[PDB]
Amino acid sequence: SVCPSDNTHATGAALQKILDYKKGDHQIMAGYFRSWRDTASGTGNKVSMLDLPDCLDIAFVFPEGDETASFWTTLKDTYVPALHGRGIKVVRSVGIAQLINTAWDNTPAGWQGLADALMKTVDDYGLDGLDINVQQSLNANQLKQATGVFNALAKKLGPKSGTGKLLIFDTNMDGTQPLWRNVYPTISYVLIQSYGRSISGLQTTYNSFKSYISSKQYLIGFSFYEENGTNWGDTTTPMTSSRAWQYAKWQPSGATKGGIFSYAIDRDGVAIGDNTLKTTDFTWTRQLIGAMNP
Numbered sequence: 001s002v003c004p005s006d007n008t009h010a011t012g013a014a015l016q017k018i019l020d021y022k023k024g025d026h027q028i029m030a031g032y033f034r035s036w037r038d039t040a041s042g043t044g045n046k047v048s049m050l051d052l053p054d055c056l057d058i059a060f061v062f063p064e065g066d067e068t069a070s071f072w073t074t075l076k077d078t079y080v081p082a083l084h085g086r087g088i089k090v091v092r093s094v095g096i097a098q099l100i101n102t103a104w105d106n107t108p109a110g111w112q113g114l115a116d117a118l119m120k121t122v123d124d125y126g127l128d129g130l131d132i133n134v135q136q137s138l139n140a141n142q143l144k145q146a147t148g149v150f151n152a153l154a155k156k157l158g159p160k161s162g163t164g165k166l167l168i169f170d171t172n173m174d175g176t177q178p179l180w181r182n183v184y185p186t187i188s189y190v191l192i193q194s195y196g197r198s199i200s201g202l203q204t205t206y207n208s209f210k211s212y213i214s215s216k217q218y219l220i221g222f223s224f225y226e227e228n229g230t231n232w233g234d235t236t237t238p239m240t241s242s243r244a245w246q247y248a249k250w251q252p253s254g255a256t257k258g259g260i261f262s263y264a265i266d267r268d269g270v271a272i273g274d275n276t277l278k279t280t281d282f283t284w285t286r287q288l289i290g291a292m293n294p
């Protein structure tokens with residue numbers, strides 16, 4: 001409610017009140033910003049991480065690996081400081097593929113070596129921590145390696161570390177996945193990719209995790225419309241009948257959730273089926289913060 005009705009970037013006491021709102025109890029908003037769509041990567045992009053709304057809690061840096069070096073330069077030198085100025089946490093996202101890479105030894109030394117290499121992706125940018133994207137089951141060997149790496153990371157990130165840095169588990173699977181059963185003690189937040197899902201199915205999914213967390217750790221995810229992407233239908237008009245909107249309102253029975261996140265926050269407000277790149281004032285993000293914290 002100390003948040004702007006447009007997308008101003010407040011400067012003094014207007015900003016301080018937003019800095020205090022964020023230290024206060026609230027349902028948090030998170031956004032995956034696709035790095036290859038940042039104006040500092042390639043050409044033809046319309047949106048910068050500098051445009052992210054002041055009332056955002058976490059920005060994920062989600063690369064695909066063909067971003068131009070200019071992106072990483074701007075992230076370290078410009079973007080991270082300005083987002084930290086707005087009290088926005090910046091977190092690097094990486095796929096589970098990275099933690100089960102067989103180029104790294106499946107041994108204590110190997111789990112530590114790999115954790116060191118992922119920790120460079122955090123420390124070299126002054127980031128607030130690391131997000132691991134899990135969308136697959138693992139064999140015994142993969143499970144063993146991923147668990148080892150989570151356990152090595154847990155020394156520097158998340159609840160076991162005492163650093164204040166985040167260790168995030170984001171997934172489209174449930175709390176029965178063996179990796180989850182191995183690593184839940186290491187986790188800051190768990191984010192459920194819930195694109196195009198039943199409002200009626202939400203409780204069932206939460207219940208699969210609720211024994212391993214408090215409800216403030218749990219966030220649910222909708223997607224914005226990706227240019228040439230899957231039509232999940234999470235952002236239909238009118239807004240206040242959207243799946244995203246109903247996600248902002250949903251609470252598990254007898255408890256309050258952590259909040260929600262968007263995939264492709266860089267696509268906030270682009271109509272479903274509009275495959276061109278546009279700018280955004282982050283209307284949906286800002287509305288959806290209001291919807292969770294009225």
Ligand SMILES: CC(=O)N[C@@H]1[C@@H](O)[C@H](O)[C@@H](CO[C@@H]2O[C@@H](C)[C@@H](O)[C@@H](O)[C@@H]2O)O[C@H]1O
Binds near residue numbers: 135172194195
């Ligand atoms: C093969 C393919 O297209 N895979 C995509 C993933 O690339 C994408 O991240 C994922 C995102 O949506 C999540 O997973 C799906 C299966 C479903 O459970 C959604 O509700 C989740 O949000 O979509 C895959 O289909």
